[model samples]
Target chain A: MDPKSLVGKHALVTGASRGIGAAIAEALAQAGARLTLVARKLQDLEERVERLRAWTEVQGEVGDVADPQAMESLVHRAQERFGPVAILVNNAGFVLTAPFLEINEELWQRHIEVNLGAAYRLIRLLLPGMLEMGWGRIINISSTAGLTGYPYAVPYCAAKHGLIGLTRALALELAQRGITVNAICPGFTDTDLLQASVLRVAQRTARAPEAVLELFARRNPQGRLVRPEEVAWAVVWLCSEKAAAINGQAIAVAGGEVMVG
Target chain B: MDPKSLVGKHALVTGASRGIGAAIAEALAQAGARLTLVARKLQDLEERVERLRAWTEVQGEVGDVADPQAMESLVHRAQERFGPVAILVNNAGFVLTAPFLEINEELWQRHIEVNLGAAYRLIRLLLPGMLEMGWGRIINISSTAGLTGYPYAVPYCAAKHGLIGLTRALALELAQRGITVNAICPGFTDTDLLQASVLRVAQRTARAPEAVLELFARRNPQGRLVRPEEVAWAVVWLCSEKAAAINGQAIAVAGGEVMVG
Candidate 1:
């Protein structure tokens, strides 16, 4: 295996029930990786696994990523079914919006726990397995919020930013050890999340939903929401041996909305 | 008063004693901002103040930024001397390196406290002054390390990454309020820090110091170390009304070594 392929490798993806996570699971399955799909609800995950099973071996697991015990059990069960996870994708996160002053300690803490701490906990649990296997890929599904900032989303921005920090630090730690960690920062995408955002903003501002959606789309140079498949393709590509050298990067899939050093 | 100018505005710079910090102080002074220079040692800050005073009013203060009491005192003295601080540059930072496994918890925590926490504390202390002024500029002197990763600087990378996060989140919080927050990420700059890194690496690898320096230079696409003045210029410009729209950005000053988005 001069250049490794996804052929028989096991990929565990968090938040794999819908939106970007669902698309990522589908892409990896098509690439020949056995899939362990994770979401908070068994019903949602089971529906995804049904579609994915057509392409490759697939299993569904349910747990809240923010709960360490839940994550521990999920990992134990997942690895028992699919061997050691060769690719781990941390995609489980949510967004909450409020003025900076209005975001209380509890909400801020919640954002940090669910968005950043969960990824840290999951990585800590799975890294040893990858270290033993001698090769691995860790992809964090960060957002443009991680690379830049947005109004009324201080907690989300901070947590996502922290996720990127964890990715960079761990990537360097494992660089020479045959493991690579990276993050994909996507812009506004066509997903339920985007729909929720549009609805909230429209209701708050009393603007038409279509108009608010247009405003969001205009933020990207391409004047469109990113397609879920676009982000999925990026994840699948990064998992390949061809991308072994691309470590500790937060690649923005936004249409020129955010760029970083 | 319509757009705003650095002229007559109080600009406080941390680590104003040397290297990129000193250069930033000089540039801000040249842009007509009254300077409040901070450093851990009075001697270092005084020397910088002496030079900066040639161009504008300047004062020197000494404090350990990792200590909140010290930051509070620094802010008190700074604002008392020059009125409200309309410009704040969080440039105080140091670089420490070790393999990931070798970095102890204390070292990691120290990195976070000094590099990231200091910025947060200073901002919290001075933000009200900016709000009262109805306009402000907060520029963080982050590093390329904040944007990407290096093999042996896990703590530094993580801390700097968090700094970027803070910059982004705060930028949006203050975006509509006339205060713009942004970060400038520079590559290997020709400074004492670079020299120290060179000596450390050279001794460890048993290579010539010049060879070690060359290796650092090669990491940048420009094949040269960035000049401190180059970073200074970016700070001065960001403080200008001309760059009013440039908010929540982490602009890389590394001659294209790292490009984001």
Candidate 2:
């Protein structure tokens, strides 16, 4: 259970096609886990896995995590390929923005299903195995929205908030189980999703995307968007035994947008 | 802008009848904010206000926050009695326990409306006035559960988590408005909510409430529930102009149960 070691343990990461998920997968591979990378796009996952193979044993799977049957089959493939997954990273989620009144039930339900439901269901399928082994790490890649709300994103806020709730309740139940449950919330990462937000908001308001970009960049006291690698480092730290006491928390990877003493 | 003093400011606190809210009301009064205490029961608020009268000016109101129309009217009465509320402490939510599987839509919605909606709506109503004044503090009295999840209390966790979400969203929106929005999450504090969860679990699990109480006490690293006044002091600190930098944060008042670096 040493924080710095994971020589033969199997690690599974969702949304491993790109961005923060890809970064975390690579970091875990660097730390010695046999990596099982899952993504909806086969070429993207395979491409990522191809690069990781030089450093570690890596497998890639294409599956839509929001679908129950597909998710179960994906987990089965991961287990068969790498044995019992010792580290689980639920990082497959997207951001969709809409006004609260305009947020129909379909949008709301889909947000919950993908952002919150997929993680819960995956845990139901995987947690028992961790309990049997007496050690595990469950890191949910929630958003800054998980720790707080965002404008034009009530459903997203609710879903991310639910993810944190799930992290906490499970953290307490399994605190003695040697499994630390936690969430890493990153703010305005320089990712495709953020770029999309910038483009959309700029288009809607007819302002330069650069102006909207600076509006977000200034939200961080550091006057910048968070880097994906910064989030990945936090994930690596949480996977360590040193982070065992840091369970049931939503740590902001943002530059001082949020803090706790 | 002296964070230490709130002289000539009107402070409003919900659920000021007892426990955390009452403690906050008194603490703010001591900090020199004229208090307008709102609770469902007039007698409870009045009795507490009587004791606080020696410290600062205070008025009591009996209003059901669960009703949006009534809450709107109540705020009107408060404004008429006092002045524009410069410091707002939303501390009125309650805890209800139910297994996730057993939680009905009705229970889920009620929790969202009370624990999350009341704060969101109340702030929406009061925030404009604060922006006009150019300085405000919005403190949502969330729970450790709000920061994370609590077992057998899924809805409560969701509601509380949503409140924190609301806190962050608005905190960012209004960060430049000279108003800071944040949530204070106390871990298993010695409050009615904690007592109720303890009593309920004790009866169902066929154990002494004292043992159940210890189970909770042991959750904190310090092996004790937090004091209400300790939570109140943190609220007072956040209300200070000094806390202007502490926006979009969920500060855990639980003895090291949750910490951020």
Candidate 3:
């Protein structure tokens, strides 16, 4: 049964150049929503535009999410292309896996501002209209680090957890309104991020890179890493009307690795 | 090394008459905490208490959690028997499985009150003294229904999710304090609740109760129901100093059934 569709919805997604972000953008696009794909590199974002064009009107923008002016212009571009930014996906964030002492000042500051701060700023700009319009969906791509303490990523953990804190508080205040704010937390997935992380951690220890990668995969009960498509499907589900009540939740896309109550 | 001992701590666990609650009480008792166990049926609570007494100081309270006066007096009696409540396990909640329309006003109200309201009230009473003492743990035994809906248990899902909302907000609001608030969401467990539910559904569908039970078990990748002891260990871990940074988390103890990021 076609319980839902985003036929007339205009959506904005960040970090849509590749990986989970692109997968999500594609999923949302396929669901019949007009899309504005944002990423730091225009060429990468442009690559995604063609594939999504079949779903609805598609466009791409180049900007750093941390700059208020840059994100403001990006949203305006999105609004001009389709309509009001009715659905927003904040996926422009990265993880820096390192020992607490090894992290420099920039790593710490950037993570705090970029991982947690950028999403906070975007929500501030988008929520007013969402509430006024009586409909909106804000999906933040968080990480397992947000819900649990990882051995070498304390700052990342702190920021992701803060993201969830913001999500719950916002969802409650706006529960009466039609808008919903949520987070999708993924564990180690088969992405460029995991490959790089495996290499980095593997070199730091005597273990082979394959062994280090196996460690991440084994964290899941299914003994495999999650796919970006799996995460995109979840996002598609969340954007549906059927997900009206699934607010303020941090649903993990892991194979039961980071289980939350 | 007995690195994790609650020798000096006085803890209170509700729904202590059976299943997960009983396991948690025994865990805390064995860890050497002076214990106060609460349940409506005095006989059932006492039976568990007698076995737990060998582990540590133990007592049972007969009171309805929904009755403010009843619960207050129970806490007062617990205070008199032990000290102030140091660790609280709000494990007393029931699920009402029915189609949304078939639910009565009382059913809806009771689910909201008993599942979420009772815990809120209990925490309000216990938190002040916990902060005063400078160290405490608040572990709410929520359910998988809290994070996601189960079709027929809308009110149950609402209250359980509300419990997580309460847990997150409190954990953050008091993040600076020495107290940690968390919720443990277990999937289908080998509890009396599951036994009753399987039988009920089996009779309704004309299926074998064992088959109905196996259906519940199949929900997890482990292909078995979660053990009460598994949840008890998770509770014990959360209460330990090692879990200081794990505040506001809703850890699932369902053998990877309810995976959250």
Go through the candidates in order and give each one's DockQ.
Answer: 0.36, 0.29, 0.02
TM-score of each: 0.77, 0.65, 0.54
Q: Give me the runs in candidate 3 sitting further than 4 Å from their true place.
A: A1-261
Q: What is the lDDT of residue B204 in candidate 3?
A: 74
| Model 3 lDDT tens row, B91-204 | 978776764445554675587678766786688678778889999999999988766556556557656766775676567656777988899999998888779888887887
- Candidate 1 lDDT at A2 equals 32
Estimate the lDDT of model 2: 0.81
Best-to-worst order by TM-score is 1, 2, 3
The TM-score that candidate 2 achieves is: 0.65
DockQ-based class of model 3: incorrect
RMSD of 3: 13.2
- Encode model 3's per-residue lDDT on A78-120: one tens digit a residue: 7776878899898878677765445554675576567766786
Best-to-worst ranking by lDDT: 1, 2, 3
Task: Write the residue-wise lDDT of candidate 1 on A1-261 in tens digits.
Answer: 232359879999998999999999988988889999989887778888988888889999888987778889889998998899999999988887776656554676577677776776677778788889999999999899888778878768867887787788788779789999999999999998789988987887789999999998999999789999999989999998889999988899998999767
TM-score of 1: 0.77
Model 3 residue A60 distance off true place after TM-score fit, in angstroms: 41
List candidate 2 segments past 4 Å from native. Answer: A1-141, A147-159, A171-196, A204-206, A210-261, B1-4, B221-223
